[PDB]
Write a protein that binds this DNA or RNA. Structure first.
Ligand code: MG
Ligand code: NA
Ligand code: NA
Length: 326
DNA sequence: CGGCATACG
DNA sequence: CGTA
DNA sequence: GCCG
């Protein structure tokens, strides 16, 4: 009965199989570090299936028939239920390769291919990277400079403060423009490692050129540590009592015709959105992105006024943001 | 066997 | 490549 | 790794 696509089932923020899903997500992460995006996707999908189950899995029998559970994912669950630990997962956890690849890829500006090159060159610590600044892009230098702050959870109080300063800059840049919180906080998370805002204006076209004006106004108030269009992946200098901390903020501008598509895309989760786009193309023959939904045979775009419109057109039961935690 | 989301900076 |  |  469990549907095969994550966009076909509700996934709440709090679920009953954290231990099993976290183990499968270790194996997914490790598959990514070794360049196997297909194995990463399967282990991610299997972990997500467990998040959608109504009760704890306590016996191997309860996996029968579940999508994305084959011999490998089932054996991991089996060893966790029988023994409380999966040897493969523990081997990965404790490996120098996994630990270093995790350390490096958590840096803003560094992905798997960069981290892997540095690993092969013998680098192992953040200090090692700092010792060779020539090997770093400007983005990576900013990621490393602010790494301690960026590893500190962002809280709702930070979000609310950031939304106010973004709203102030947006309103100074374009009267009538709006700011919508997206990302994990819109899904109900109480913490995050960044904050996402989606900006539009109710009159189509008025938002042209808006994001550079917003960034200038934020930079003039001393709020920007790093940036650099319609998407800006920033590091903000967020005031705190007596001080400040760096926070990752993403700002996105969309024309209002695209707003429901951008809201859907930027609200996530990442797996939910990959699965939704896969479902759209493979099951419905329609092409989905954060700008629109395209019928390639009629050569037309679907006009949506809400996220609900997008789900209904795809033949999917609507899921509110707090049920998209795939 | 081959696919695996789909953009922008 | 990196970001989402 | 799993599945169409
Ligand atoms: Mg973000
Ligand atoms: Na990174
Ligand atoms: Na986010």
């Amino acid at each position: 009965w469990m549907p095969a696509y994550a966009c076909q089932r509700p996934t709440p923020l709090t679920h009953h199989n954290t231990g099993l899903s976290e183990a499968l997500e270790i194996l997914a992460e490790a598959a990514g570090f070794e360049g196997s995006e297909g194995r990463l996707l399967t282990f991610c999908r299997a972990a997500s299936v467990l998040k959608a189950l109504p009760s704890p899995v306590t016996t191997l029998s309860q996996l029968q028939g579940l999508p994305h559970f084959g011999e490998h994912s089932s054996r991991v669950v089996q060893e966790l239920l029988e023994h409380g630990v999966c040897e493969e997962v523990e081997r990965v956890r404790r490996s120098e390769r996994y630990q270093t690849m995790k350390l490096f890829t958590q840096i803003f500006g560094v992905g798997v291919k960069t981290a892997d090159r540095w690993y092969r060159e013998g680098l192992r610590t953040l200090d090692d990277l700092r010792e060779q600044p020539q090997k770093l892009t400007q983005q990576q230098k900013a990621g490393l400079q602010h790494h301690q702050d960026l590893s500190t959870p962002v809280l709702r109080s930070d979000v609310d403060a950031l939304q106010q300063v973004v709203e102030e800059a947006v309103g100074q840049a374009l009267p009538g423009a709006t700011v919508t919180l997206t990302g994990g906080f819109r899904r109900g998370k109480l913490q995050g490692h960044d904050v996402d805002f989606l900006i539009t204006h109710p009159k189509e076209g008025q938002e042209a050129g808006l994001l550079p004006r917003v960034m200038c106004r934020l930079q003039d108030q001393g709020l920007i540590l790093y940036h650099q269009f319609e998407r800006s992946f920033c590091i903000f200098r967020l005031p705190q009592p007596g001080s400040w901390k760096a926070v990752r903020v993403d700002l996105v501008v969309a024309p209002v015709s695209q707003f429901p598509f951008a809201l859907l895309g930027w609200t996530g989760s990442k797996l939910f959105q990959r699965e939704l786009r896969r479902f759209s193309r493979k099951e419905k023959g329609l092409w989905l992105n954060s700008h629109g939904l395209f019928d390639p045979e009629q050569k037309t775009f679907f006009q949506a006024a809400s996220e609900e419109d997008i789900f209904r057109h795809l033949g999917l039961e609507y899921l509110p943001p707090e049920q998209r935690n795939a």
